[PDB]
Each structure stands twice: as C-alpha cells, then as structure tokens.
Amino acid sequence: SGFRKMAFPSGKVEGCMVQVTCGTTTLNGLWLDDVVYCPRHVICTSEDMLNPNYEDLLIRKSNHNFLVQAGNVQLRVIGHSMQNCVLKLKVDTANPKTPKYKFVRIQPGQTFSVLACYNGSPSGVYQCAMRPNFTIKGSFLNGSCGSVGFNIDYDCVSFCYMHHMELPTGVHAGTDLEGNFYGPFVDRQTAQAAGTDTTITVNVLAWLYAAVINGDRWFLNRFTTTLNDFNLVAMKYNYEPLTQDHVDILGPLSAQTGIAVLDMCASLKELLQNGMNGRTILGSALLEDEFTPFDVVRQCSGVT
Amino acid sequence: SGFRKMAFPSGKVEGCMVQVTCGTTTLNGLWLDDVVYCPRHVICTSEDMLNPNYEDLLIRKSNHNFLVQAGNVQLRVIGHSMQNCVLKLKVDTANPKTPKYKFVRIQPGQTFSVLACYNGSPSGVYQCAMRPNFTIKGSFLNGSCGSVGFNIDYDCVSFCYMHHMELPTGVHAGTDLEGNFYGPFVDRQTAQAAGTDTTITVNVLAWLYAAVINGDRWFLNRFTTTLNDFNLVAMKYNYEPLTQDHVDILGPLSAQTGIAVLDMCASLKELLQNGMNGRTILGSALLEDEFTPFDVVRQCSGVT
Numbered sequence A, B: 001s002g003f004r005k006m007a008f009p010s011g012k013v014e015g016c017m018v019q020v021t022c023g024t025t026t027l028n029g030l031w032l033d034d035v036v037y038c039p040r041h042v043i044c045t046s047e048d049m050l051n052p053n054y055e056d057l058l059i060r061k062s063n064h065n066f067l068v069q070a071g072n073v074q075l076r077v078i079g080h081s082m083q084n085c086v087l088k089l090k091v092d093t094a095n096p097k098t099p100k101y102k103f104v105r106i107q108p109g110q111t112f113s114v115l116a117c118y119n120g121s122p123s124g125v126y127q128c129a130m131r132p133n134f135t136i137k138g139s140f141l142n143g144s145c146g147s148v149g150f151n152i153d154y155d156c157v158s159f160c161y162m163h164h165m166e167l168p169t170g171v172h173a174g175t176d177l178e179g180n181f182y183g184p185f186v187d188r189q190t191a192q193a194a195g196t197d198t199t200i201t202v203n204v205l206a207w208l209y210a211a212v213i214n215g216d217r218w219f220l221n222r223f224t225t226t227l228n229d230f231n232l233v234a235m236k237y238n239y240e241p242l243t244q245d246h247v248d249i250l251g252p253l254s255a256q257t258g259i260a261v262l263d264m265c266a267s268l269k270e271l272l273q274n275g276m277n278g279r280t281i282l283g284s285a286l287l288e289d290e291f292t293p294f295d296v297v298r299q300c301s302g303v304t
C-alpha cells in the first residue's frame, strides 16, 4: 500500500552520461554504442544564442573541438553531424555499459523519468510529464542541458527527452533523441511563450483509481456522467478532453476497482465544481495529473 | 529553475540488491562486501508472523536454508547471524559493485531515497522522510521488504532504512542497517498504532525558501515573529517545534534570499492561519515537509 511519485531506477542511464565541452561551454551528453548525443547549442557563445546559425557555427568546429569525458577518461571523437537540434559525436569506443535502448517520441500526457546531470555527473532523478503545451516542469540549473528523460520496459531504456532550454517563465523545453523539439520551441535565446497548461484528465482519473486502491475513497460520489457532459465541465476547468481511447486505457483500473470509468468521471466532475474543501487525496490538496494509467497499474502491481 | 521532489540516482544501490528466499518466503537483501542484509522475518511462515520467537525459529535454519540470488546466479551462504531485526548472511563472494558506504541512523525529519525492489529487482525510486512518529509514507507491495533507503554524499552511499512492515493504517515501518526499528515498532503481525504525524516545520521553511528562489513569492508577508510566538501557533497546527538549531541550519537559505528565518516563520504563521485560499506554492496546494534545508541547497546549487 501507499502511492508515491516514482521514477525508474536510473542506473542504466547513469552508465550513459558523459561531459561534452565545445570551447568554454560544458553540458551533458548521452553515450550509446559509439555515438554521444548532446544539444547542438553546445557550439554557441551566449552571444551566438541570441540568433545562432548552427550550420555556419558548425563549419568552424572539427571533431577535435568536441571534448568528451566519461568518468575521468577522454573519448576520441572521430566524426560529428547535426541531426535537427542535436549533435551526434562518433567516438572510437562503444559505451561498454550501453543498455538495450530505443528512441521514442512521446505524446503530451506521457510521463518519464529525468536523470538531472551536471558535468556528465548524475545529481538526481525525478518523474515528469510532457505537458499538453509540450513543456515539462523540471528542475534544471545551468550545466543541466543534455540531461535525458526515459522510460524502462524491463531491460530496454526508451529515451524520449533531452533537455535544451528554460522559457522565461522557468518551464522547460527539449527534443526527442532525433533532435526534434517537443512543441514549437527553437534553441534560440528569444522570448518564447508556452500555451495553456491544461490538466491531463486521463492521468487524474488513473490517480483517482490509485487513491481508491489505497483506501482514499471519500470523494467517490453517487453520480455518473457521459463523455460529452464530462467534457463540457472539463473544457471549463482547462482539463484535456477525454476520448473513448482514454476510457479504454482506464479499463484495467475500472475492472480492478469495480468503478465504471464514467462514474469516476462524475466523481472528478464534482471535485472540480465543489473543490477539495481542505481534504487531501493520496496526501495531495490538488488533483495529480503526472501518473499515467500504465504508471498506476505498474506501481499497484509491482513491475520490475 | 524549477523545484522537484528528487531522489538520488539509484545505480550504486541497484548493484547491491539480491533476492533472499527462506522456504516459501522471498524478499530483498542488500549485498555489501561478503554480507547480505535482509529482514529476519524472511524465516517466518505468515503463521509464525502472529507471535514469532526469532531465536527459536532460527535454530531450525542452516546457511543452506538461505537462498541468495544476484541477477540469475546463486551466492554460497557460509554463515548467518541475527543482529536485532536483520539477518546478516555471510556469502563466499564480495559484491564486486559494492560502493563506498556507511550505515547511519537518521533523525525524524531526515529525507532519503528508497529503491523499491521485488525479487531483488529494482522497480522504482522515490523520496521519503522519516516522519516525526518514526513511520514513513512509502509505496510497498508484498515482496518489497528488504528494499532500502539511502542518501549519497558524492560517491559514499549512507544506508539509513530497510523496509520491514506496513501498519494496518498502510504507513510503513523499518530498521536501520543494524536492525533497530525506527520508533517503537516490532516485526510481529500485531495491531501497532502510529503516534501524531506532525509537520516537519524546518522542512516546510526550507521549501518556502526554495519557492522564493524559484519566483513563487506571493505568500511573503510584512510580518516577523519570535521562536516562542511561532511555536505557540506551530503546536496548535501539529507542526514540530522550531529550535535555534533549525534556525542555524536555515542560515544559508536566509543569506541567499535576504529573508531572515523569523520573517519566513511569520509568513508560514500567516499561511497556517489564513490557508492557501486556492493558491499553489511550487505546484502544491499544501505545505511540503519532505525537503530538508540540505536538500534545498543541494537542488538549488546542483551538487552531483
């Protein structure tokens, strides 16, 4: 029993973190096989950051301009290319600790673990979601760029995020491991505003199920609703629309608890309209939206 | 910027987790040098759990009755002893991945990372505090016993907790790595009630400082207070008393923010009396008490 915001064990990813230096800039790289992945803005002077032309800045860089350090040993760079907003540095040595891995582009609402690193050294691990506005709310200081987000399926690390930048509002933006930004963000020191940070409805419902499973039942009401009726209230409260695909994903939690998805929707509806009234659910005074249905099943069943 | 509930990277501890089996019971063990540490209740039939005499149950066990598996290789048990509520199994092989480590008994309010494991396999990592009633609010299913709590000081893992049991209220109790329970709990399937789960005042203040540092300033008020005046309000709200030792520990956050500790106390005083009024601090609708002053400094400076 009990329900915690829980990150994947970080060991497999710790074994992949290196320090990348280009001139005076140091950030983090991901070493998989004989490639080190890092944000391309490693090549920028903070002067360059204001309006960088990366192709032109890259002409001025050779393999030997990229200093890659793994623990306290230097890796030989024998090649470099730009793929979208990431640099791929070919090194002469395959990472001996390379796990089984995939690169995956996640959807908004998908959760992942971040191993926050500085100088290629892991400092902490926390759980995030891709926000509906394709930002994440991370914890990232200067030097943290190249820190990665991931999921683990048993022994396969799916890398879904690389940290690139902080918006002036102090929310975070980054790429998949093919270097494509989540959302409309660019690696340029220019004012970029995030859209509406809506609540991930399917994630709230999953967490309401997690609450019932852990004995927090006070919010269970005597009502049901429909997707359309629920969605009208959702829209008004800046909740994401719930689709039948969401209802299907919630099926196993529905089955385990004997609470129909639309009944739990009607409970959430009343929580939005009535508020918490100073009560808590799983030790929270607001509705948590950074657990997926899969996260709740995983934690409430004990997958390793 | 941003502020997250952040666990230590778990890699160093992942390399220490083994499966321990005694008869039909499987739980987790910690393998450091040539010793495997596990909860002594590994020797109990759930029948035994109701009123176990561990010395008497242990007479019936030999070295060969303890099955220790690390990955999918069996370790040879060449010795076993009971120290308080843990078994120490001497094995013929020093753990090659043994990190630098200490065993430490933490104080209430101290935070730590838990690597939740099942069958010696890590499933997740989360951040906990030792509650003032010497319980923790964890996430632990059957098979999770022997899961450990830890802090990392650079390359030295301080092990502070081993998971033993769930109280009927679904909060958690365990030992240090010398097998001494935190609080008055015993490894017996008998009704045990926790005392008052008070709020860790010094931890709330640290997190209020973390909030100011990250631009959440709305709760900063025009008042100050004294330790005695603050403590009267604290007592009424089931907050732990604040001592000068707490004020001293908050000094560096005081210095960084230019907010005197007693001023921040007066802000917290108003938050207790006035409540949040539907506002959030660092994305929370209640006052967070599972960050220590040291945690806030570490995250707000970027220690690795």
Ligand SMILES: NS(=O)(=O)c1ccc(Br)cc1
Pocket (backbone or CB within 6 Å): A041, A049, A164, A165, A166, A167, A168, A186, A187, A188, A189, A190, A191, A192
């Ligand atoms: N925090 S900011 O000045 O908006 C900024 C945006 C993008 C980059 Br890449 C670097 C800095």
Ligand SMILES: NS(=O)(=O)c1ccc(Br)cc1
Pocket (backbone or CB within 6 Å): B041, B049, B164, B165, B166, B167, B168, B186, B187, B188, B189, B190, B191, B192
């Ligand atoms: N959950 S309980 O029945 O109170 C319990 C207490 C202690 C042990 Br050790 C096992 C079970």
